[PDB]
Ligand binder design. Structure first.
Ligand code: MYR
Ligand code: MYR
Ligand code: MYR
Ligand code: DAO
Ligand code: DAO
Lengths: 285, 29, 252, 178, 285, 252, 178, 29, 29
């Protein structure tokens, strides 16, 4: 019943964990505690098998541990800066090749899976710093340029007409802009990792750069040159919605160094490169 | 777009836009 | 007996009298591509028994100082009979595999090998900036790669076994389909893996789907060290099918 | 030839060497010279494409001129064929010129991914189409020793475009005034 | 069922492309690959006719390729400038003879058809540049003046009373103004092209200027003269809604030079005037 | 129209707008081997579309002095893609064929080619005692043999076209599956032949089942001799299946 | 040992003193050395945890090497046991090495509160797990005198995490560039 | 202006203004 | 989320968000 299911949603009790049943002393030739990890399987022994347990009714739920929940939180993926220093025409617009590889926080979460499929919610937080005192009337234009569409080379480029591309215009003082993007891949899922090349020569590119081209985000201050200079920083936040993920993997253990690659750097003292805190010895807790 | 249930405790699962990408977080299971 | 196994593929039959069961990657048995998931429209060629048979790779020597070995699929079989020919004559290919790792010693030897099948094992380079692993290095063929032997070059992948050659910790490799060859219990490991990819078929020349990684987690030890203890890998393609026939691709 | 109707014709003539190459182009819908065709122009208003392409050829020589030609499509993952033998190992049609002037070669959708980028992208390059002499161009005496051929392109029942975008095949470098 | 149809709308699966059926080898005196382009028809040969195909279920849809979708995106058609330099009374108002011919991006799309009929959605994006520092309280008036109605000649002209004409007043800080306009032609459809004149003499006008008069848009800063000068640029965006189009045509191959005419200019090196990239020869891909 | 033909095999489609029907050798259409006639017990591999497709051989020039040409099957296709690979990797093979000979000229040219498919065309040597045709000479590959060009050797087969290169008269070749390419009527010949042999499958390396013989019985003549008139042969295997997989046989 | 596969193995050998301690660690899911295990890493993305933990151990000596070991879990409210006698008064498993190489010790959820903090918190410290020689490591002659043991961890049917938070097991100290 | 369908999955195709030009993008076909 | 009562005096106890913590002050008893 969709209404009972509804109540479970409100209470967050869709996925309940099992109870612990009462167990008793045993003397048997069946030894559940013994197994063989060589098989590649995890021994499914439970507490009732090793100790005498009491009956306990569980009230914990796994709803919050769902993939939708884990990846369904909006995190920063880019900080766009438009700093008017000495040339308005050159400094009032910019572009960014879109990716989820530049901020470690969300990158690491998505990379705990090999493939992922989801729709995207993008929320933008623009902040106008009054370097000279006044901000005037700031109007911004954020244009999504799919691969192949002409990229504007000036603040008055004809490409800004946005005759076909999607553009979002924001006016200072109005609420933060937000829009959704359908799953954009030409494949059935996004590659979080890709052990492949775009060719078969020594100069072929390796990794997700080959498969993950999502276009460019071009920004521009629509307002013409003003007396007072401003520094507009637009932070882009991304949230995955309607998510599916496949083939889990070990979490990134070292710092990221570059986009689209698993490359890392190691110091002479490797213990400083990982989160593992050195133990004094085996018996010192 | 409205999924109206009844139990009375009526549920209205409204979808305000015409594209699936627009809806909120997915149900579970 | 639960310790015995016989695997027949085409004209090959492999046996082991000391196994530790078998692992079916992600619980999915390999199968041919269905019309619902297909995209390429030409009729696929399915060599059947001439390709879906066991191919034994070059054996390796396991000694007290071994750091590990890895092979990439389908690369390791690019030179294996009919399977190899088909992967170069066609743009697209698709296949599952039965991997059978072999290593016998004695009841007075000890050692443990971690055998793992990793999907999309995108290798890293260390301290080389944004320079990625060169095509040549990730395509060693049937010889595979012996970790900690290769004289460094700029495009040379990571050889850090404890960091999985990709910046993640060794202890967590168990999240991937795997088995252990613990000399006291078994003399072989068997893993059956389905085709895993975000596309239904792919270029077997530029995309390695699976990587077989073997790391000795417990050092080989005995009181008869002169006796060489090899590791032999036999791989059998399953449900191999190809599409987009043309001339033979020559690499390099 | 640009700026002339001749940019639309391929000239054929009696050959002295066998199996000579006539032409070779990329199959990528928005690559040149396919870009300015109607389908190439429409494809340029989208980011992704999928489906099979239909290439047609109309012989325009005299009614007494004969010819057999081999038209081939080479799927990706290999370079363009260097010879007729190499090319025919792929998808192909042997065209016999006769009463019916036109032939059609279908470039089937043979791709790893369900869609490809309309903009030139290494990962999504669709391959090549080459044309070779199967036999030879033959004419009786007192007949022109060369003839033209026209080439057409359109999409099959499964051609489809996706993700609207602004075209890069037209620009505005200044104000359009009254 | 309007609900099943509804789901198709949400999923964008209203127009599905056909499947590819499995085919077999053939030896026949029926040769579908042979035809005659002289007829003016396209050979309807499909992949199953030339090669042995497998059965593939298609999941692609043509919804996004619909005329409604193609022309249903808001693009800039005009950039109105009110630059207060030295005379508020003269520089605080302006007018524009409305047309969809001044911006190449949307003009080219509409011109891929001979006739088109649609309602129009106009969205305006005003941006006030504080030339001297402060903007004060900017209130704008945009009046739609149909052909024949009196055009204001001063910022205080009685025509601004808008006793009958539609005027939109916008206050700085408030959301972008927007309104719809019904199909305005005196004909059944708008002429994208018109091989005709408004008379039969050597001095008769030729082209769409004869048929496409949509009036004038008159703008004015309602706010009286302020101490600080501002430059108000109002960008007009147009979107076609409920669209129908007839008789498709070749896309514009050269740059536009003027409104309401197909006139073009050619340089001495014509290859630079078209998008065609010169080939080295016939066999160089 | 009865003058037109379209033949589709795998990814290849051949057309001709001036045919003289088609001949099905001995009235039997090629088919796979049945369990009732089979002898080899391993499961056969059937490449299907990757092997059963048209392969175009090297074109030949027909002039006023041409004596003829011949190719042997499967030899002529030993180097043709997947079909070629399969015939060397397997001891046994079996296949039917669609042979399409092409030759266009003009309505002012005249000439006639006799196109014949001969089963077991055991070639003879002339005036050389009991010395038989050498393996190399009966295995010319896709180039075939141009009659009356080869500089004699001891193991060189007969080049007597009027004696069918075997001691029988040319006029009687019509008892074998054949067609004529009479320039005034047709520009191609099409013959579909089934597998013919005293054994169900055979070694494709040492036994040529069929021989394609083309003899110009009526000299090529016209008033525009400078225009070269080629002859092109395209052959498509049908129901190709192989058995007894092993390493690749290398000949010579 | 960090930076070496040996950081994952515990060495066992013939003892001269009885009931010697082999190892001792905290049971706290996100404490070291449990922190970098998959369960420790996932737990670090949450604020609260509950449930029982399953610790497994695989002996890697020769087939001829024997051993009996005592694995114990000491509930909180007391220090880590200083002796085998002290440790066995708590929850424990006596592991006999044989044909089956692996044994599992379950650390039952014994807490005052229904949940505990994943981050080290005095009030919610879960206790300790110690390992002691029950008998001894014994081998026949001509057999290696030391052997390794591997240790694993996973959650039981009732393991559960709550209140998503950002992890402290990974950081970004600079820009990640192209 | 409301086109209410039922299937329960109820659809509400609301037209907020009194002129046809005011409605959003047209359905297809 | 809507608890629709009828008596006509219809009551609509709407819950706009999907988490119980989000609702207003509790009823009594
Ligand atoms: C669903 O596809 C259409 C969404 C319509 C959005 C408007 C929802 C409010 C409906 C109020 C109607 C009151 C019934 C009398
Ligand atoms: C249609 O022509 C009129 C549009 C009316 C707009 C108001 C829509 C909300 C209706 C809510 C009614 C709730 C029913 C009880
Ligand atoms: C409850 O769980 C869902 C809350 C939905 C919020 C929208 C309430 C307005 C519903 C108007 C519908 C009019 C009926 C025709
Ligand atoms: C325009 C705002 C940014 C939109 C991001 C959505 C795209 C997600 C694809 C992730 C692929 C990757 O980063 O490797
Ligand atoms: C007042 C804002 C502009 C309204 C534009 C709608 C009129 C479209 C008619 C197009 C005719 C043409 O441009 O030739």
């Amino acid at each position: 019943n969709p209404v009972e299911r509804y109540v479970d949603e409100v209470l967050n009790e869709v996925l309940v964990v099992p109870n612990i049943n009462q167990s008793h002393p045993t003397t048997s030739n069946a030894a559940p505690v013994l197994d063989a990890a060589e098989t590649g399987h995890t021994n499914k022994i439970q507490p009732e098998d090793t100790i005498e347990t009491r009956y306990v009714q569980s009230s914990q739920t796994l709803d919050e541990m769902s993939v939708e929940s884990f990846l369904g939180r909006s995190g920063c993926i880019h900080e766009s800066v438009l700093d008017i220093v000495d040339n308005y025409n050159d400094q009032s617009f910019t572009k960014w090749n879109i990716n989820l590889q530049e901020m470690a926080q969300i990158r690491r979460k998505f990379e705990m899976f090999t493939y992922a499929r989801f729709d995207s919610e993008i929320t933008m937080v623009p902040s106008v710093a009054a370097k000279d005192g006044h901000i005037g009337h700031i109007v911004m234009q954020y244009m999504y340029v799919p691969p192949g569409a002409p990229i504007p080379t000036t603040r008055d480029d004809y490409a800004w007409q946005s005759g076909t591309n999607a553009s979002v215009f924001w006016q200072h003082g109005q609420p933060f802009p937000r829009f959704s993007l359908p799953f954009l891949s030409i494949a059935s899922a996004y590659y979080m990792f890709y052990d492949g090349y775009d060719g078969d020569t020594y100069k072929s590119r390796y990794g997700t750069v080959v498969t993950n081209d999502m276009g460019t985000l071009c920004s521009r201050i629509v307002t013409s040159e003003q007396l007072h200079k401003v520094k507009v920083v637009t932070r882009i936040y991304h949230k995955a919605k309607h998510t599916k993920a496949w083939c889990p993997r070990p979490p990134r253990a070292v710092q990221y160094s570059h986009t689209h690659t698993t490359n890392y750097k190691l110091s002479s003292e490797v213990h400083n490169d990982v989160a593992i805190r050195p133990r004094t010895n085996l018996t010192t807790v | 777009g409205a999924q109206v249930s009844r139990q009375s405790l009526n549920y209205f699962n409204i979808n305000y836009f015409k594209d699936a990408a627009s809806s909120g977080a997915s149900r579970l299971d | 007996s639960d310790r015995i196994i016989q695997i027949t593929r085409g004209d090959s039959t492999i046996t082991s009298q000391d196994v530790a069961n078998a692992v079916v990657g992600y619980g999915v048995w390999p199968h041919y591509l269905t019309p619902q998931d297909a995209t390429a429209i030409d009729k696929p060629t399915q060599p059947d028994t001439s390709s879906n048979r066991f191919y034994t790779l070059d054996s390796k020597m396991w000694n007290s100082t071994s750091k590990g070995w890895w092979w990439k699929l389908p690369d390791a079989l690019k030179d294996m009979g009919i399977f190899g020919e088909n992967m170069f004559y066609h743009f697209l290919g698709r296949s599952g595999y039965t991997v059978h790792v072999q290593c016998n010693a004695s009841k007075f030897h000890q050692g443990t090998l971690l055998v793992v099948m990793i999907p999309e094992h995108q290798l890293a380079t260390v301290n080389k900036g944004n320079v990625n692993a060169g095509y040549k290095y990730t395509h060693p063929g049937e010889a595979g790669r012996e970790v900690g032997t290769q004289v460094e070059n700029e495009k040379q992948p990571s050889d850090d076994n404890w960091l999985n050659f990709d910046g993640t910790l060794l202890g967590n490799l168990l999240i991937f389909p795997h088995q252990f060859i613990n000399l006291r219990s078994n003399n072989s490991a068997t893993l059956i893996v389905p085709y895993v990819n975000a596309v239904p078929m792919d270029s077997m020349v530029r995309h390695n789907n699976w990587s077989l990684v073997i790391i000795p987690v417990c050092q080989l030890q005995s009181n008869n060290i002169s006796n060489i203890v090899p590791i032999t890998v036999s791989i059998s393609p399953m449900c191999a099918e190809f599409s987009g026939a043309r001339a033979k691709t020559v690499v390099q | 030839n640009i700026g002339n109707v001749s940019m639309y014709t391929v000239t054929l003539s009696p050959q002295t060497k066998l199996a000579e190459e006539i032409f070779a182009i990329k199959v990528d819908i928005a690559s040149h010279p396919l870009a300015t065709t109607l389908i190439g122009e429409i494809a340029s208003y989208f980011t992704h494409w999928t489906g099979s392409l239909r290439f047609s050829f109309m012989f325009c020589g005299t009614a007494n001129t004969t010819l057999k030609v081999l038209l081939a499509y080479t799927p990706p993952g290999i370079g363009k064929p260097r010879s007729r033998k190499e090319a025919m190992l792929g998808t192909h049609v042997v065209w016999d010129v006769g009463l019916q002037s036109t032939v059609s070669l279908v470039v089937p959708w043979i791709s790893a991914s369900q869609y490809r980028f309309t903009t030139p992208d290494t990962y999504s390059s669709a391959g090549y189409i080459t044309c070779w002499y199967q036999t030879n161009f033959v004419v009786p005496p007192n007949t022109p020793n060369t003839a033209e051929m026209l080439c057409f392109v359109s999409g099959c029942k499964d051609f489809c475009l996706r993700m609207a975008r602004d075209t890069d095949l037209h620009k505005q470098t200044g104000p359009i005034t009254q």
